[PDB]
Amino acid sequence: TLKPKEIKFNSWEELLKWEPGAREDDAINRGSVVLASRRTGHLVNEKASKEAKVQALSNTNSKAKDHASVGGEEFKAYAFDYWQYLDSMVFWEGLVPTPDVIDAGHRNGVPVYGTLFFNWSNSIADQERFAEALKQDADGSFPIARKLVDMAKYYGYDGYFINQETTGDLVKPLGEKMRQFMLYSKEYAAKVNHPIKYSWYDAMTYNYGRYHQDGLGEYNYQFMQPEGDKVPADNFFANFNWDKAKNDYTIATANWIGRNPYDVFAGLELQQGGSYKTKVKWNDILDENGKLRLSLGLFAPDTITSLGKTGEDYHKNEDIFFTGYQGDPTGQKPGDKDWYGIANLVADRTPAVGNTFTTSFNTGHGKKWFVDGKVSKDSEWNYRSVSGVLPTWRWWQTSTGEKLRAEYDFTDAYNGGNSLKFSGDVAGKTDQDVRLYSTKLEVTEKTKLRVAHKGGKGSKVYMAFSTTPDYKFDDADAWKELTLSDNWTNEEFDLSSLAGKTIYAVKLFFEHEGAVKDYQFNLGQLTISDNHQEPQSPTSFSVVKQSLKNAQEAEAVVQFKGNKDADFYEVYEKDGDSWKLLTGSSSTTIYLPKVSRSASAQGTTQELKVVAVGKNGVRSEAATTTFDWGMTVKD
Numbered sequence: 001t002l003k004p005k006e007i008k009f010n011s012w013e014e015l016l017k018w019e020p021g022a023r024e025d026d027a028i029n030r031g032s033v034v035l036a037s038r039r040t041g042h043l044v045n046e047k048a049s050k051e052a053k054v055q056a057l058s059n060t061n062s063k064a065k066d067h068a069s070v071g072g073e074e075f076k077a078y079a080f081d082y083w084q085y086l087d088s089m090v091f092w093e094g095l096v097p098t099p100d101v102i103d104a105g106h107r108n109g110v111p112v113y114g115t116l117f118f119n120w121s122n123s124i125a126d127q128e129r130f131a132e133a134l135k136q137d138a139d140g141s142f143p144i145a146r147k148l149v150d151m152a153k154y155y156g157y158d159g160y161f162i163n164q165e166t167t168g169d170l171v172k173p174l175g176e177k178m179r180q181f182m183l184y185s186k187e188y189a190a191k192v193n194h195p196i197k198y199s200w201y202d203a204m205t206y207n208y209g210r211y212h213q214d215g216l217g218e219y220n221y222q223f224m225q226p227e228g229d230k231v232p233a234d235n236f237f238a239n240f241n242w243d244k245a246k247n248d249y250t251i252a253t254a255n256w257i258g259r260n261p262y263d264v265f266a267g268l269e270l271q272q273g274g275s276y277k278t279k280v281k282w283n284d285i286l287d288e289n290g291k292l293r294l295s296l297g298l299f300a301p302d303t304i305t306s307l308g309k310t311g312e313d314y315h316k317n318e319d320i321f322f323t324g325y326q327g328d329p330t331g332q333k334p335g336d337k338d339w340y341g342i343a344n345l346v347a348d349r350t351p352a353v354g355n356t357f358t359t360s361f362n363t364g365h366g367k368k369w370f371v372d373g374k375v376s377k378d379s380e381w382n383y384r385s386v387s388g389v390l391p392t393w394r395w396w397q398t399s400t401g402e403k404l405r406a407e408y409d410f411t412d413a414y415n416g417g418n419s420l421k422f423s424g425d426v427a428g429k430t431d432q433d434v435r436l437y438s439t440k441l442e443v444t445e446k447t448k449l450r451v452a453h454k455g456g457k458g459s460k461v462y463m464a465f466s467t468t469p470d471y472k473f474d475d476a477d478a479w480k481e482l483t484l485s486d487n488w489t490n491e492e493f494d495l496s497s498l499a500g501k502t503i504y505a506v507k508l509f510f511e512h513e514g515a516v517k518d519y520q521f522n523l524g525q526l527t528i529s530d531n532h533q534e535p536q537s538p539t540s541f542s543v544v545k546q547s548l549k550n551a552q553e554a555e556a557v558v559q560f561k562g563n564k565d566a567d568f569y570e571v572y573e574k575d576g577d578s579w580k581l582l583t584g585s586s587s588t589t590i591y592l593p594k595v596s597r598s599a600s601a602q603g604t605t606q607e608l609k610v611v612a613v614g615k616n617g618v619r620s621e622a623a624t625t626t627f628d629w630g631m632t633v634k635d
Ligand SMILES: CC1=N[C@@H]2[C@@H](O)[C@H](O)[C@@H](CO)O[C@@H]2S1
Pocket: 057, 163, 201, 237, 269, 299
């Protein structure tokens, strides 16, 4: 079997037999992107909190039988890109997050956790499954804790959410061991140089089995109680039926035991509630100033995919959820809505830090895959391992008059599946901007800007940078006019005049001198970097496995050696006279679900190539290999 699959264990004995590398799809299942650092920028919303956090508990993956752990040949996906508002992403469906989610989260500076789920049950079988997890060696260590930590290290993820819903007589006396399991895990993770965090559901009490407090209280505080420095649960997920009094209690309890109240995440039941249609007791969790007094736990926000029919609808619905109905993260909840956008209440963060930042707005899925503005893969995909860094703000706009509509464009892109489009009927002379990214990028004599764009007929368009933390765009050396045309162009600008300064934000600015019917401008790629070099080509590239369906269709797995300058890799086949992209991945082992030849294909072999796409946005020279069909298409 070539297709990589989610990792699932039928028993604790099976987990105890786990060893690094002992599964045929391990090379693909490992995360490949190290967890990025993030900056917390200046607040842009007067009601936002830098203390309040958001944890998402999401069913991230297809449920289709025989779906791949890396994605698939379908556009519709939980192509999450609102990482800027998340503390963490919980992979709800299983113990071991898939590489497509680990990679996307890590590139965006967000930790990803597996889920250790004990069934809502009092069956002896379930009670025993729970007790069995807490088996100890003579020295008091927990062998299952070691395997959890070992897996987190090997596959490259950040810890676990524990949902302990099993109850009954055998469960009740096990609070102490469960607490010690979590503390021991920390000791062991430190020992193996791979720290992990635990998030803990408000379910199993210390002494009385399952009982939801809807908060932190007298029956569950032990799970958050510190051992000086160390803690058992890092994060606590409060059950959904909180209120003012329960929240007051939670805060009192956290403070008393010496924990930050914001480590308590007040649950929102978004599955039964319908995503942003969920009734929340906002008045019970907002203080006198309209600011959050606890964190927010998002239960099943993946539900939002049910609210639209298309993949384009997925992102628009996420906008309502994360930004708010008012459509601008600097604005307040409309008077005729109940839902607060996350951005209304929670400060954004940004992984766009250092001397290099690049993006082509790759959301990890598309209808097609574009290569320098030309269709290369002419069909749908989701491979979230390649997910990039989308705008911090969606959409922070100011205008002298009317505002252009900003949206993702899955019909035309520069690299990957979509660009950003800014469009509308312009009624008359107007100046306006769109503030896109919060950043902290150090400029040197070697720093350049590369910007790929298209359209803008009837306007002047500029990109401008703020060199202050409070996002003022008053620096004359930080404005660049774009040279517009009807086709994709990629322009480089010298940023050396800004050497020694720091860029804190990026915006577009539009001038229209009069009316323009169906104005459109696309932004396709943005790079700020002191590196203009092609990354080195991959080496030692080969087909390591294959399975022909027929003479025209095969699965394959390819492997190669990369380098530190590569952000991710693209694999292509030569289809007649044309190279066509198959897939992309952050990994150096890559599954090809369909290598294909037409009816007119000549010979018994077919060329494949792999290209490194740099952290600086530049492609390497290709490495090539030959796929051997062993037969002609007419044989
Ligand atoms: C964390 C949580 N664990 C439980 C889930 O397994 C259920 O599906 C959900 C039903 O609303 O309730 C709590 S939320």
